[PDB]
Amino acid sequence: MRHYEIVFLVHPDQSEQVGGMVERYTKAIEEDGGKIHRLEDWGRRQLAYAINNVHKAHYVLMNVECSAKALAELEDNFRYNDAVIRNLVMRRDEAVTEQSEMLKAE
């Protein structure tokens, strides 16, 4: 497969099914044969500008292994959902597993 890194933020009013959406997304690539290397939930932050007239969002960061089929279906899931709001897919050449910032502030 290929390594991929995904940043995915969610509408604040839907920030209760986000976990379930996460394992639902993980499943499909698991039965496809993909892998999960890092999962991180550092959401409920303040936006730097208004996006679709909201000011908060729920951020999730996932590093995955997937093929073209799995990435395409996940990306369509991002396309036609209504809590997706915004998205970024940023393929890397390796695999990373140990945190980005979590909550550095005490």
Binding site: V7, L9, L47, A48, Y49, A50, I51, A57, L61, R86, L88, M90, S100, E101
Partner: protein, 62 residues
């Protein structure tokens, strides 16, 4: 960025990135911070990439 940490500047580390943006929100020229050209290009792409995800503002006003 070559001494000990940050082999490649990351868009997620906002603490490093905010040190290279002015109060208006623009990218500071490399002739001021003394940053090397290659690392300056990495900062530029990291700042734009974080700007897309709304971690950093395009402009101070909005």
């Amino acid at each position: 960025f070559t001494a000990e940490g940050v082999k490649e500047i990351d868009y997620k580390d906002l603490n490093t990135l905010k040190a290279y943006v002015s109060e208006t929100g623009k990218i500071v020229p490399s002739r001021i911070t003394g940053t090397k050209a290659k690392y300056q290009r990495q900062l530029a792409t990291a700042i734009k990439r974080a700007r897309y995800l709304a971690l950093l503002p395009y402009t101070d006003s909005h």
